[PDB]
Design a protein around this nucleic acid. Structure first.
Ligand SMILES: Nc1ncnc2c1ncn2[C@@H]1O[C@H](COP(=O)(O)OP(=O)(O)O)[C@@H](O)[C@H]1O
Ligand SMILES: Nc1ncnc2c1ncn2[C@@H]1O[C@H](COP(=O)(O)OP(=O)(O)O)[C@@H](O)[C@H]1O
Ligand code: VO4
Ligand code: VO4
Ligand SMILES: [Mg+2]
Ligand SMILES: [Mg+2]
Ligand SMILES: [Mg+2]
Ligand SMILES: [Mg+2]
Ligand SMILES: [Mg+2]
Ligand SMILES: [Mg+2]
Ligand SMILES: [Mg+2]
Ligand SMILES: [Mg+2]
Ligand SMILES: [Mg+2]
Ligand SMILES: [Mg+2]
Ligand SMILES: [Mg+2]
Ligand SMILES: [Mg+2]
Ligand SMILES: [Mg+2]
Ligand SMILES: [Mg+2]
Ligand SMILES: [Mg+2]
Ligand SMILES: [Mg+2]
Ligand SMILES: [Mg+2]
Ligand SMILES: [Mg+2]
Ligand SMILES: [Mg+2]
Ligand SMILES: [Mg+2]
Ligand SMILES: [Mg+2]
Ligand SMILES: [Mg+2]
Ligand SMILES: [Mg+2]
Ligand SMILES: [Mg+2]
Ligand SMILES: [Mg+2]
Ligand SMILES: [Mg+2]
Ligand SMILES: [Mg+2]
Ligand SMILES: [Mg+2]
Ligand SMILES: [Mg+2]
Ligand SMILES: [Mg+2]
Ligand SMILES: [Mg+2]
Ligand SMILES: [Mg+2]
Ligand SMILES: [Mg+2]
Ligand SMILES: [Mg+2]
Ligand SMILES: [Mg+2]
Ligand SMILES: [Mg+2]
Ligand SMILES: [Mg+2]
Ligand SMILES: [Mg+2]
Ligand SMILES: [Mg+2]
Ligand SMILES: [Mg+2]
Ligand SMILES: [Mg+2]
Ligand SMILES: [Mg+2]
Ligand SMILES: [Mg+2]
Ligand SMILES: [Mg+2]
Ligand SMILES: [Mg+2]
Ligand SMILES: [Mg+2]
Ligand SMILES: [Mg+2]
Ligand SMILES: [Mg+2]
Ligand SMILES: [Mg+2]
Ligand SMILES: [Mg+2]
Ligand SMILES: [Mg+2]
Ligand SMILES: [Mg+2]
Ligand SMILES: [Mg+2]
Ligand SMILES: [Mg+2]
Ligand SMILES: [Mg+2]
Ligand SMILES: [Mg+2]
Ligand SMILES: [Mg+2]
Ligand SMILES: [Mg+2]
Ligand SMILES: [Zn+2]
Lengths: 48, 553
RNA sequence: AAUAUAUAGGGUGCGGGAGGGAACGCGGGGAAGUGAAACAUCUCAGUACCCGUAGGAGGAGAAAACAAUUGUGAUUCCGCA
RNA sequence: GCCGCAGCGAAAGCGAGUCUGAAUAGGGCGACCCACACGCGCAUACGCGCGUGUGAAUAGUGGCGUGUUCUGGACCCGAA
RNA sequence: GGGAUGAGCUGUGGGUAGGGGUGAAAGGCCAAUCAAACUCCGUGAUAGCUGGUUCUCCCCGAAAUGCAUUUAGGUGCAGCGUUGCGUGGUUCACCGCGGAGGUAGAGCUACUGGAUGGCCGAUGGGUUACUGACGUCAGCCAAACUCCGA
RNA sequence: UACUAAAAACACAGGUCCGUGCGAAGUCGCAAGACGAUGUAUACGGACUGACGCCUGCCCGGUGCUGGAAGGUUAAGAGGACCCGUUAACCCGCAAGGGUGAAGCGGAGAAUUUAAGCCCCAGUAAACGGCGGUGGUAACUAUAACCAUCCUAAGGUAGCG
RNA sequence: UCGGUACGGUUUGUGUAGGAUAGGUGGGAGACUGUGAAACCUCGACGCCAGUUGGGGCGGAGUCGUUGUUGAAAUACCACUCUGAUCGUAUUGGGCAUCUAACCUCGAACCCUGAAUCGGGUUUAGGGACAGUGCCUGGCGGGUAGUUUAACUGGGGCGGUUGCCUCCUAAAAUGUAACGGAGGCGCCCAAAGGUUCCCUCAACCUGGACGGCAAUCAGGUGGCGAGUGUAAAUGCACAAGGGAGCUUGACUGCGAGACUUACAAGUCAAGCAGGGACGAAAGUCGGGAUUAGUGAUCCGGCACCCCCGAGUGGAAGGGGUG
RNA sequence: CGCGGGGUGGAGCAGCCUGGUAGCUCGUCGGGCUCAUAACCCGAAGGUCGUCGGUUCAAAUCCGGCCCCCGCAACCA
RNA sequence: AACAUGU
C-alpha cells in the first residue's frame, strides 16, 4: 500500500533518492525538484 | 521459427490486483490471436507492455529486431487539425518529411552550394522508389474511400463517436505494423465497418492481437484464443464458444476443490480447540499445518459479482414524448427530415442506423440541449428524464470514482430516497478501496459502469441509453438487459449490437434513407425480428459488396 | 567329442605358484564416537579398520613443465615462502 | 628467511603525508622535543619559522626463566 | 497340584547370528547379562554433571548485582579483588554558596473521578408527599487526582 | 514372560477378503542360486475373525487399494530463434579514442516436442474409518406414536444394557 | 503411414476506367501455330473478389503481343519468387505391422561323461530389437538410517507470555523486580512536510423560514474545560490548535561537543561550503509537538562510478558508492 | 477455576470472516377454495440483532465490560 | 395424472 519508490533524474537518469508514496492516493508517478550531485544543481525527478 | 514478440517471466501487478505472474508465450508472424477475458482482467495492460507504453515489474519483454508496433488505444486520441492532416501524422509520418525536404531542395539548393546538397537530395530521392511515396496526394484518397471517412476538409472536434474511430483506424492500417495491437476495435462501429475490418484482417501480413468482447467478430479475425484469468494466461484454440465452456469448467473444478478444503478445516479446527489431555502433547506439526490450510483458504476468496440495478421512478402519464414533423440539421446536409412518432409507455425502443446519421442529435433535441429547425418536441408534465451519454462527458479524469458520483457527501438522492453513497457505488461493483481509483486508471468496461452511476441517480422514469453495450462483457451485458425488461418506465436504446436489440425491444425507430432523400426515418411497431422481415418487404426485396483494399499493395 | 574344417577336452614331459614375517611402501574400499555448546553441509579423516600386491627400500622420474617478456631446464626429500 | 626500518587508501596510486570531497573546508588515520640561551621580518611579554648546539630521549631484536593462552588425552578419576 | 498315546517327552548328530536369528507372541530367548549379545580395536570416546587435587609462612582481600544468551545450576563483557608502570589529592567527610524535583504530608468551589447530610428543583414516574439532573451551604476520600509542598 | 504375571492373553478347527497362471506371488541374497514345491487356483502366501446356533444393518465424503485416460500440470534427451564476449574489415579521426561490425570459436540459453506421477473419472467398507442437533404435540399429571426446522457422505438397524 | 527440412512441378492474388486488374521485380518485341466462339473434352481445382487460367480430348483453317489508352502500373511469352494451396523426388525423425541375425529360453535331443536333475558346447523348437543390464532422469518411498522437537514457571505439565512505545508501582535526580496494575505498535500523510503572513476554541445564554437538545446566522459571556492522524505522559492559547499563498530542506559533502551505554547499537547537535524554497528583510528549513510504526551478520539482486583484470589486449569474475 | 463456541420476530436457522440494503422455511392474522375441516392459493403484520460503551460519516457485524446457555481439559506421585 | 377426513 506504501511501496518504496525511487526517484531517477531527468537529465542523467541517476537514481539519487528513495522514499515512499501511497499508491492509491497517488496513482501517477511523483515529480519533485531535487538536488542532483552529478549535475551539481536542482533537476526534476520522476519515479521509475 | 522466426518470431515477433516474446515474453519471459513477465509479472505486472497493481499490488493486490495481479495482471501477469510468471508468464511466457511467443508470437509468430501470420498469427491471428484474439484475446478474451472478463472486465478488469488486465487485457489492456498486456497491450500497453507489448506497445512499449508500460514496463513490467520483474520480467523481460522485447520486440524482435525490425517489425515495429502500432497500437489502437481503447480511447484513441487525435489532433487539432483536419481529417486529411489527421491521417498523415502516422502512416505517412516518417515519410512525408522526406517529401517535405525534396520539395525544399528543388529551390533552396539552386541558389546555394551545389556540391554537398547533391547527396542530401540523393539519399532522399532514393527513399521514394522503394515505398512509391510519390502518390501521397492520392494514397490518402484511397484509404478514406475504404473506411467511408468523413470529408477531409472540415475539423474533427464535432464528429460522431464512430467517426473518430474510423479516422483512427486509418492511422494504423496505413503504417502496416507487423504487430497490430487493437484494443476493442468494434466499439462505435456500425455493421459495415466491422464487416469491412473482418475482410481486411483476413489477408493481412503480420501478427494481430484484438481484445474483443463480442462473439462474432472474434470468430472471423481470430483462430487462436488467448485468455486472462486471475493472473494467468491460457493459450488454446477455438472459436469463442469454447471459451465460455472452459471458464465454466475452470470454476466448477476449482469451486468444489475449495469445498473439500473447507470441510477439512472444520475437522481440524475441532482438534485445535479440544484441549490437551493427561500428559500428552498437542503436536506442533498439526498446529503448523492448520495455520497453513487456514492461510490458503482465505486467498481463494475472490468470487463476487454485482447486478445492474436501475432505480424506479414516479408514475408515467399517457403522453411520454411526442414528436411532430421534426426537421434537424447543421449545414446544407440535413440529418432528420419530417419525422413523426410518439414514445410509448412501458416499452423498450431501439434506435438503429449507421454512423454519423443523426442518432445522438435526436436525443439532444429531446433532452433540451439543441434547438429544432422546424417542428417541435413535446414532453409532458409527468416525465422526469434520465440521460446517459455516449461521450462520457460527465466523468472527469483527475477525480476519484467515489467523489464523482457523490461530491464529498455521505448520502445522495437516487429519486425520493436516500441511500448512502459508498453503499450506492458498491452496488455498482466498485467495492472496498477500489472506490479511490481516479477515472484515468479505470478500465473501459467500468467507465460504462461509472457513467451509469452518475446519470441513473436522477431517478427518472424515462432513461435514454446512448450505447450502453459498449465495453461490457457477457456477464454484465446480460445483467443490463435483464434490468431493462424489469424497468417500469420507458427506455430508449441506441445500439449497433444486432444480438442486443433482438433480445430486448418492443419498438424500432430506424434510419431508412436512400439516395434521393438521405434524411428520412421510420417508426415501427414491433420487435427487431419483425422489423427485418418488414424491411425486406417494403424497400428492396432481398436487397436491404467487394472489399475496398485501402492500398495498392 | 557332438561333427565336417576344427575347437572344448583328455594323455605325456619339463619349469613356476601356494603359506609365514614387528615396522616401513604403493593401489583400491572406507567408519563412528568427537568438534561445531543441538544438528544434517562441514569436521573428526582419507584417520581406525579391511582388500590386493611388493621391495630391501618403495613410489615418482627424462617436460604435451613452469615462468612472464628476461629467464629456469628429469624426479624425490629437508628448510622457508 | 623472519622481525625492525613510513604511513595512508577498497584499489589504481601518492608518500611526512594520505583517504573522503567541488573545496588552500572539516574530519579520519599517520608524522612532528622549542627543558635550552642565541641569530630571524619576532617582542608591551610568552611565541612563529630555521640555524647553532647547551649535545635533549627515543629502539628494536635474539636467548634463557616466569604468569596466562593455542593445538594435542592436556590437572586426575567416572557413564549409559 | 496339572498333563500323562500326544500339537507328548527324550537321547545322539546337524542347520539358522547381531538391526540378524528364532518366537502357539511374553519384547520372550540367543552361554547366570538382551527395547539390539559378547570380546578386541577407534580409545586415555565425550559429560554445561558429581567426586578428588599433597610442604610452610608473610601482605592485601572479594562476590551471589547489571546486560546479553536454545539462556536460567552454564558462559561472554561490565561491576567488586590483587599486582606492574603512569597521574598526585583529583576520592571521601564536614561547612558556606549555586541549582532541578513532585515522595511524605496536606488540599480539592484548582482539574479527573469517588462520595455524606441539608437547600433549590430541570426531568422521569400516577394532576404529584415517588425519582432528585445541574446548581449552592457545610463535612470528606484517591498508587495511575494535583492550586501546593518538605 | 528360564528367575515375582499361566490368565479373560497367544494358538486353535471353522469363516471371509486380498494377492498368485507357474524357475508363480512371497521370502533369503549385490548376483548366481535356493525355499515355496519335487506343489499348479479344491493349490500356495498375506490380513483379520476365532467350535457351534441364529445373525452380520446404513455410509465411498476423508485416507487407502483397484480400474480408467478426455483435460490441465510436469524430468532428462531432442531443438538452439534471439541477446552477449572476442576481431577480420571499415568510418569520423589527436589517428592519445570512439562507433558500426562478416566468419569461426565460445558463454547464457527461449518457443516447440515428450512418459510415469499428481490433479481429475468411477468402483470398493469381513478395506483403515464414520453412523446428528433444537423446539413444540394426546381426555388429570407424565411421556410423546406425530409434526416444524437446520445440518450431513450417512445419521447406530437386529440384539444388548 | 503421419509430420520436419532441403529440391523441383503445377497453381493463387481483381476498391476505383480495364483484357473478372501480369501479385512483385527484371528481360522483351515477339510467342506459339491459334475455335471454354472447339470435336471426344467442354470449371465436376477453386468456383466467392465470374469467367478465363482447365477435364490437357488435339489442329498445323479459326485466341492473345507490341500500337491505340483506359492507369500507381499494364497486357504476349519467360528465367526471376513473396502469401496460400497441392503434387513429386531425395534425406531425416515419430507411429503401426512384418522379418531374423544380435540378444533371450529351468522347452527338447546329443557330446564332453567313466559315475552328473550342475556347468559348457553343437543342433533343433520358440520368443525378439522387446525384455534384461550400464549411464542419465522424474516418481514413489517409516522398508531402513541419522537427528531435531526452545525457555520463563512459587515442582513439571496444562493455560499464558517473549521485541518496541507511555504511565503507575519506583521510596520528590537517574535506575529498579514479580505469571504486579492499566493501555498502545508492526502504521499513516505528496500534505497532516518546508516557509511567510492572518485568526482563537469548547461549553452556556438571548433572537431567528423549514429547524428539533444539537446543522448555518446574529449578539453577549467565556483564559483554556476544545483541539493535537494515532495509546499514554510531558507540552502547547506566545500557540505546537484553525485558515490561506507560493513551494519540495521528506537536500548532496560534512560535523566541534554531548547524552546514553558491558559490548553491538541508540539519540541530540551549534556551525562551515555547495545548489535551492519561502521572506521586503532578519532569518528559518537535513520530514511530521515530542517519545513507538521495526531486524545484526552472512549470502545475494539491481543502478551507477570505471578501482583490480592470473602472459598481453579485452572479457568473465571481483571492488567501491547509493 | 481455566481455555472457546453461542445469543437474530412465536419456533428453527442464515447474515458476522470481507462494516451501509435485516433475510429463509414454518407458525400467527385477514381473504379465497369446500357442505365443512385439513391441504393448497393470495395479501399482510411481527426484531430492543442478549445487555451498554467505544472506534467510525455510518455497527447485527469491528473492539472492550457484563448477564445466561453449551462443549472441553483437569494429569505424575 | 387432483383425491385425505366427518363422534
Ligand atoms: N495506473 C493504474 N494504477 C492503479 N490501478 C490500475 C491502473 N491501471 C489499471 N488499474 C487497475 O487494473 C485493472 C486493469 O485494467 P485493464 O483490465 O487492463 O483494462 P481493460 O479491461 O481495458 O483491459 C483495472 O480494473 C484497474 O482497476
Ligand atoms: N456541433 C456540430 N456541428 C456540426 N455538425 C455536427 C455537430 N455535431 C455533430 N455533427 C454532425 O452530425 C452528424 C451526425 O452525428 P450523429 O449521428 O448524431 O452522432 P451519433 O453517431 O453519435 O448519433 C455527424 O456526421 C457530425 O459531423
Ligand atoms: O457514430 V455512432 O456508432 O454514435 O452512430
Ligand atoms: O478491455 V475492457 O474489459 O475495459 O472492454
Ligand atoms: Mg492528493
Ligand atoms: Mg480495454
Ligand atoms: Mg451516437
Ligand atoms: Mg605371498
Ligand atoms: Mg558424524
Ligand atoms: Mg556437537
Ligand atoms: Mg557438548
Ligand atoms: Mg627380496
Ligand atoms: Mg622403483
Ligand atoms: Mg594497509
Ligand atoms: Mg589532515
Ligand atoms: Mg501328580
Ligand atoms: Mg484333576
Ligand atoms: Mg492324569
Ligand atoms: Mg551344534
Ligand atoms: Mg540369559
Ligand atoms: Mg543400537
Ligand atoms: Mg579419535
Ligand atoms: Mg573424561
Ligand atoms: Mg585486612
Ligand atoms: Mg568475568
Ligand atoms: Mg542548598
Ligand atoms: Mg529542595
Ligand atoms: Mg507522579
Ligand atoms: Mg497522602
Ligand atoms: Mg468532584
Ligand atoms: Mg447531594
Ligand atoms: Mg500523591
Ligand atoms: Mg515369571
Ligand atoms: Mg520372485
Ligand atoms: Mg481367491
Ligand atoms: Mg482385510
Ligand atoms: Mg480376538
Ligand atoms: Mg484361520
Ligand atoms: Mg470416489
Ligand atoms: Mg456397498
Ligand atoms: Mg459411538
Ligand atoms: Mg434398539
Ligand atoms: Mg526413525
Ligand atoms: Mg552424532
Ligand atoms: Mg523448563
Ligand atoms: Mg506451576
Ligand atoms: Mg525517579
Ligand atoms: Mg529516590
Ligand atoms: Mg503548509
Ligand atoms: Mg499550524
Ligand atoms: Mg525519507
Ligand atoms: Mg562527529
Ligand atoms: Mg546557502
Ligand atoms: Mg527572492
Ligand atoms: Mg540547520
Ligand atoms: Mg506521532
Ligand atoms: Mg551464518
Ligand atoms: Mg589477461
Ligand atoms: Mg563487471
Ligand atoms: Mg560517502
Ligand atoms: Mg388463514
Ligand atoms: Mg496414574
Ligand atoms: Zn542529474
Amino acid at each position: 500500500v506504501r511501496p518504496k519508490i525511487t526517484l531517477a533524474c531527468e537529465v542523467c537518469k541517476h537514481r539519487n533518492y528513495i522514499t515512499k508514496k501511497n499508491r492509491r492516493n497517488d496513482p501517477d508517478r511523483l515529480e519533485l525538484k531535487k538536488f542532483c550531485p552529478n549535475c551539481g544543481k536542482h533537476q526534476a525527478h520522476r519515479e521509475t | 521459427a522466426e518470431f515477433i514478440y516474446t515474453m519471459k517471466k513477465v509479472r505486472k501487478a497493481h499490488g493486490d490486483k495481479v495482471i501477469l505472474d510468471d508468464v511466457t508465450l511467443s508470437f509468430y508472424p501470420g498469427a491471428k490471436i484474439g484475446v478474451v477475458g472478463p472486465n478488469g482482467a488486465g487485457k489492456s495492460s498486456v497491450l500497453r507492455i507489448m506497445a512499449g507504453l508500460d514496463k513490467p515489474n520483474n520480467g523481460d519483454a522485447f520486440l524482435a529486431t525490425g517489425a515495429t508496433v502500432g497500437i489502437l488505444q481503447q480511447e484513441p486520441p487525435l489532433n487539432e487539425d483536419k481529417t486529411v492532416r489527421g491521417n498523415v501524422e502516422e502512416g505517412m509520418g516518417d515519410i512525408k518529411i522526406k517529401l517535405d525536404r525534396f520539395n525544399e531542395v528543388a529551390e533552396l539548393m539552386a541558389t546555394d552550394y551545389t556540391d554537398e546538397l547533391m547527396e542530401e537530395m540523393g539519399r532522399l530521392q532514393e527513399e521514394l522508389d522503394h515505398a512509391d511515396a510519390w502518390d501521397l496526394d492520392a494514397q490518402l484518397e484511397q484509404a478514406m474511400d475504404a473506411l467511408r471517412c468523413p470529408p477531409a476538409d472540415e475539423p474533427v472536434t464535432n464528429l460522431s463517436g464512430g467517426e473518430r474511430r474510423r479516422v483512427a483506424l486509418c492511422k494504423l492500417l496505413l503504417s502496416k505494423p507487423d504487430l497490430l495491437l487493437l484494443d476493442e476495435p468494434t466499439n462505435h462501429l456500425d455493421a459495415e465497418s466491422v464487416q469491412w475490418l473482418e475482410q481486411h484482417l483476413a489477408s493481412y501480413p503480420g501478427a494481430i492481437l484484438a481484445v474483443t468482447h463480442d462473439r462474432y467478430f472474434l470468430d472471423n479475425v481470430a483462430e487462436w484464443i488467448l485468455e486472462l484469468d486471475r493472473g494467468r494466461a491460457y493459450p488454446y484454440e477455438g472459436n469463442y464458444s469454447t471459451y465460455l465452456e472452459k471458464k465454466a469448467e475452470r470454476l466448477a473444478v476449482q469451486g468444489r476443490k475449495d469445498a473439500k478444503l473447507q470441510k477439512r478445516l472444520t475437522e481440524e479446527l475441532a482438534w485445535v480447540r479440544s484441549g490437551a489431555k493427561a500428559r500428552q502433547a498437542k503436536s506442533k506439526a498439526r498446529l503448523q499445518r492448520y495455520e497453513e490450510m487456514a492461510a490458503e483458504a482465505e486467498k481463494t476468496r475472490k468470487l463476487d459479482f454485482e447486478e445492474i440495478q436501475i432505480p424506479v421512478g414516479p408514475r408515467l402519464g399517457n403522453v411520454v414524448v411526442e414528436v411532430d414533423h421534426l426537421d434537424k440539421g447543421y449545414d446544407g446536409r440535413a440529418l432528420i427530415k419530417d419525422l413523426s412518432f410518439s414514445l410509448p409507455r412501458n416499452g423498450i425502443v431501439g434506435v438503429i442506423g449507421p454512423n454519423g446519421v443523426g442518432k445522438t442529435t435526436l436525443f439532444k433535441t429531446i433532452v433540451g440541449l439543441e434547438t429544432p429547425d422546424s417542428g417541435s418536441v413535446k414532453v409532458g408534465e409527468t416525465v422526469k428524464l434520465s440521460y446517459v451519454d455516449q461521450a462520457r462527458a460527465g466523468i472527469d479524469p483527475r477525480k476519484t470514482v467515489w467523489e464523482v458520483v457523490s461530491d464529498g457527501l455521505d448520502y445522495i438522492q437516487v429519486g425520493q430516497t436516500e441511500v448512502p453513497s459508498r453503499a450506492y457505488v458498491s452496488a455498482f461493483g466498485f467495492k472496498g478501496p477500489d472506490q479511490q481509483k481516479p477515472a484515468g486508471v479505470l478500465s473501459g468496461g467500468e467507465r460504462n459502469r461509472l457513467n451509469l452511476a452518475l446519470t441513473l441517480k436522477q431517478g427518472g422514469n424515462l432513461i435514454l441509453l446512448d450505447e450502453p453495450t459498449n465495453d461490457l462483457d457477457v456477464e454484465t451485458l446480460g445483467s443490463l438487459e435483464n434490468a431493462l425488461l424489469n424497468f417500469p418506465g420507458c427506455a430508449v436504446v441506441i445500439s449497433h449490437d444486432r444480438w442486443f436489440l433482438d433480445r430486448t425491444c418492443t419498438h424500432i425507430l430506424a434510419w431508412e434513407g436512400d439516395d434521393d432523400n438521405e434524411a428520412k426515418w421510420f417508426w415501427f411497431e414491433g420487435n427487431f425480428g419483425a422489423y427485418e422481415e418488414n424491411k425486406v418487404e417494403r424497400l428492396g426485396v432481398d436487397a436491404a459488396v467487394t472489399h475496398r483494399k485501402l492500398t495498392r499493395g
